[PDB]
Ligand binder design. Sequence first.
Ligand code: SAM
Ligand code: MG
Lengths: 199, 236
Amino acid sequence: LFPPQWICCDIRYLDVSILGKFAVVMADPPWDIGTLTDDEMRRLNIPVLQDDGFLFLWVTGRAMELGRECLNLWGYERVDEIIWVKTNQLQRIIRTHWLNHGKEHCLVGVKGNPQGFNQGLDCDVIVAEVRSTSHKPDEIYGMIERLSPGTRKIELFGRPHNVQPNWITLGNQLDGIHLLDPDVVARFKQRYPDGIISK
Amino acid sequence: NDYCQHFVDTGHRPQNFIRDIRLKDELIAKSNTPPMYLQADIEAFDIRELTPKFDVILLEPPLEEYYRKCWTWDDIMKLEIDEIAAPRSFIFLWCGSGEGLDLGRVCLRKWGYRRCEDICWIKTNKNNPGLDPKAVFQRTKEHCLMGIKGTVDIDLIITEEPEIGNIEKPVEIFHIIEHFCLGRRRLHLFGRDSTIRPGWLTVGPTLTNSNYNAETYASYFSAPNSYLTGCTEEIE
Ligand SMILES: C[S@@+](CC[C@H](N)C(=O)[O-])C[C@H]1O[C@@H](n2cnc3c(N)ncnc32)[C@H](O)[C@@H]1O
Ligand SMILES: [Mg+2]
């Protein structure tokens, strides 16, 4: 299933063990600073999603610390930190408590011992235009594709405009369930025969 | 226009394409204490000898990664910074780009601070378009964490990458710190002759000269001047 796939769900309740293993996980959680409590975040079954690979975790504010905690609790070591410098259409920094903030951070965690990834191709600064509220730059998908070409990836807390080839996207603002990978389809039907994803 | 792809294609870092109060600088300059400085091997020196307690501490330990006497995070975390920080005070800790982003946060909490800003020194390579085994990406920035204890600038500094073997941090960090108007007892640990500055006490192993005297230094802050912010007029 190379084309985009997605599952509208409450990520707290989905049995993510049906989705298999992924080279890259990316998440942009609704940190409690429609949100998840710190305990709900800690309890996410991230550990089943990967054996060896990388996690990309967007953070702001006190989630710079809570996100590190989660990353470690889930079994990752933080090994890089991408910053997105937020610009307008003319490549000028958009200036938004002690300092105006010109950037957002994406923690990069590693689990296991990833082999065959193209580390060091991209640098750790993204310069990209702001779009609607919370919309992260599409540049990150290209960085991740160059890092790990053709592998399966999963995005948590994505919206419709986040769906991409080679990715499965999970989130509660997606429209229904679009699955094409026959292994995932089979396991989904077995786990959710009536298509309903409840507590 | 994907500047990430462009960097892969050409070696020009994305930050190369970012397109880039007098009275307040004036008041800071007027209220600044004289520069004071002390050569001290900080690993072998009882920092409690540095008095009075500081409103602002800038901490710039010489990390191994800056070169590629260096200080490890083991060394740094065992500094007793809480013993010289005022009950309400601020810290600015240069953490580099690797494990310091984690261990520097541990240090801040160990010394009784909470992080309130993460200031990123973003390095362009306009002049020279074109490591760590764990690294996933080319590292092109450094972080200076701001911590607070007790009850117009942006969190980005953009300059060209320095020539190799030059470990200086951008002087812009002093501008940011001084514009906060946090108090006048300002300590720069692991500063150098090249970083000495009015309004600051600089302490470090490579200083060639000293002029620090604890009693003279304390007299700069004795009444009626004990609580000035560093941004208001001198008291007649
Ligand atoms: C920070 S936004 C994600 C932004 C996205 N990365 C983008 O580029 O637009 C967080 C998303 O999580 C969704 N969300 C909140 N609670 C959720 C839950 N319990 N289960 C699944 N999604 C949830 C919200 O609807 C919101 O779309
Ligand atoms: Mg529809």
